[PDB]
Amino acid sequence: QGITFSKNDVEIIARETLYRGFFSLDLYRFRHRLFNGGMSGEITREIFERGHAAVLLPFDPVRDEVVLVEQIRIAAYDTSESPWLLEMVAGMIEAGETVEDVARREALEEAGLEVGRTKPILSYLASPGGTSERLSILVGEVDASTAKGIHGLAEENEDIRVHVVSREQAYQWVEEGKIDNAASVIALQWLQLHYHNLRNEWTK
Amino acid sequence: QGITFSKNDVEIIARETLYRGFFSLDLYRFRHRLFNGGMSGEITREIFERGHAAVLLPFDPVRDEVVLVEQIRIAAYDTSESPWLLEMVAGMIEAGETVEDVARREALEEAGLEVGRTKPILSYLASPGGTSERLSILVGEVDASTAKGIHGLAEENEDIRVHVVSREQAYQWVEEGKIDNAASVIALQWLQLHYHNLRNEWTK
Numbered sequence: 542q543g544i545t546f547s548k549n550d551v552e553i554i555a556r557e558t559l560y561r562g563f564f565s566l567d568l569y570r571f572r573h574r575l576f577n578g579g580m581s582g583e584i585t586r587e588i589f590e591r592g593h594a595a596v597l598l599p600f601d602p603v604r605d606e607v608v609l610v611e612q613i614r615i616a617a618y619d620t621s622e623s624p625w626l627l628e629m630v631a632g633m634i635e636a637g638e639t640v641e642d643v644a645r646r647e648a649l650e651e652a653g654l655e656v657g658r659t660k661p662i663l664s665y666l667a668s669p670g671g672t673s674e675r676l677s678i679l680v681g682e683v684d685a686s687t688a689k690g691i692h693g694l695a696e697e698n699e700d701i702r703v704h705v706v707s708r709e710q711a712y713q714w715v716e717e718g719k720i721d722n723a724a725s726v727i728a729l730q731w732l733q734l735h736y737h738n739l740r741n742e743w744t745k
Numbered sequence: 746q747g748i749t750f751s752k753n754d755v756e757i758i759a760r761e762t763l764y765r766g767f768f769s770l771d772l773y774r775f776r777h778r779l780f781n782g783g784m785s786g787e788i789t790r791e792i793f794e795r796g797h798a799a800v801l802l803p804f805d806p807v808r809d810e811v812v813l814v815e816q817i818r819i820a821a822y823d824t825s826e827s828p829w830l831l832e833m834v835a836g837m838i839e840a841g842e843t844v845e846d847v848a849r850r851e852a853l854e855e856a857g858l859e860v861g862r863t864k865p866i867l868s869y870l871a872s873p874g875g876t877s878e879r880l881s882i883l884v885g886e887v888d889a890s891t892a893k894g895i896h897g898l899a900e901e902n903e904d905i906r907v908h909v910v911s912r913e914q915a916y917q918w919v920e921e922g923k924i925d926n927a928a929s930v931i932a933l934q935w936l937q938l939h940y941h942n943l944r945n946e947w948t949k
């Protein structure tokens with residue numbers, strides 16, 4: 542069971558930069574094995590390269606509360622009622638950094654939060670038909686009573702508002718489409734599947 | 746409660762397409778309201794633009810099985826053990842098409858599956874800090890005993906293998922990281938939260 546082929550079955554011949562900016566768009570040229578037994582010809586695909594991210598679900602297990610951060614995401618504009626989204630704390634992982642380093646730095650910069658214990662949730666590919674981006678989600682223990690106000694680095698043109706909701710209310714917002722970005726959906730569905738054991742572990 | 750600002754609170758000054766090929770790399774220039782009052786200066790953001798997608802989770806409620814499709818996604822290569830991924834059926838929504846029409850068409854083209862009833866799951870933004878892409882997921886009733894074979898438009902360099910597994914195995918693969926693309930994680934977490942009611946609904 543499971544997948545059929547490995548890295549032994551594909552050769553990346555070359556990569557070419559198509560667009561070089563803050564982010565990049567690359568052309569990968571490659572050949573690969575086929576399910577019918579043969580080899581493909583040389584194929585090309587465009588791939589959006591923007592690095593990889595750490596995501597933190599800030600969960601208060603005592604109060605059963607979740608911290609959300611609100612900020613504009615202009616890319617949401619064309620398909621959303623508003624480009625301001627309710628999200629998990631998140632940021633890019635720089636060379637040599639750990640997921641936890643980033644999650645803790647972003648929790649402070651974006652939400653004013655200290656973080657206690659942490660556990661992995663999931664690491665996922667955002668949209669692997671067109672981008673390499675991987676996001677690694679942690680749940681972090683927080684005191685939601687300390688989560689409030691406006692944060693973000695104005696030097697980065699980052700303007701962020703903290704919201705505190707109950708876990709049930711956050712999940713209701715997913716169901717209703719009020720929270721509709723992948724990282725937050727994945728994190729909050731995970732929390733609905735795991736909260737009983739997580740709260741027991743963190744309130745012993 | 747919820748979000749603070751609407752489309753009246755942002756002015757998109759300019760959009761430019763800096764790269765156009767299979768996909769597009771756009772630049773948005775805009776100003777927006779700030780939480781503490783007033784307006785930002787002009788902000789520029791690069792946005793990966795690839796249109797929007799329909800996704801179908803093929804679920805057999807009699808058998809408690811899901812149908813997965815396997816194909817190479819070279820963008821996964823740098824952060825994954827193999828670039829062949831296990832995924833939901835999916836494809837682009839063209840002008841004036843509905844999510845449901847596309848989902849039903851792709852289930853036949855990618856997996857050879859006829860679909861019975863459908864229900865919405867969720868519609869999400871894949872990674873809204875850098876891409877506009879929205880994906881809308883349905884669950885689709887299938888007879889998984891009919892799911893077999895190799896599919897794809899070879900003229901479009903598309904090579905796809907169909908797998909049938911129990912829902913429980915598919916979900917355990919999410920937990921283990923063997924299924925780790927956003928659309929499949931979201932769909933299978935949703936299924937884990939909803940399958941009991943869905944099976945009752947679809948096996949009357």
Ligand SMILES: O=P(O)(O)OC[C@H]1O[C@H](O)[C@H](O)[C@@H]1O
Pocket residue numbers: 668669670671672798835836837878880926
């Ligand atoms: O199956 P394709 O038509 O290549 O692409 C459909 C979607 O599934 C893949 O993850 C892509 O990134 C898209 O979001």
Ligand SMILES: O=P(O)(O)OC[C@H]1O[C@H](O)[C@H](O)[C@@H]1O
Pocket residue numbers: 594631632633674676872873874875876
């Ligand atoms: O908060 P940022 O540093 O802008 O970006 C972190 C992640 O959250 C946003 O959806 C982006 O697309 C990334 O995937």
Ligand SMILES: [Mg+2]
Pocket residue numbers: 630631632647651
């Ligand atoms: Mg951030």
Ligand SMILES: [Mg+2]
Pocket residue numbers: 834835836855
């Ligand atoms: Mg497809």
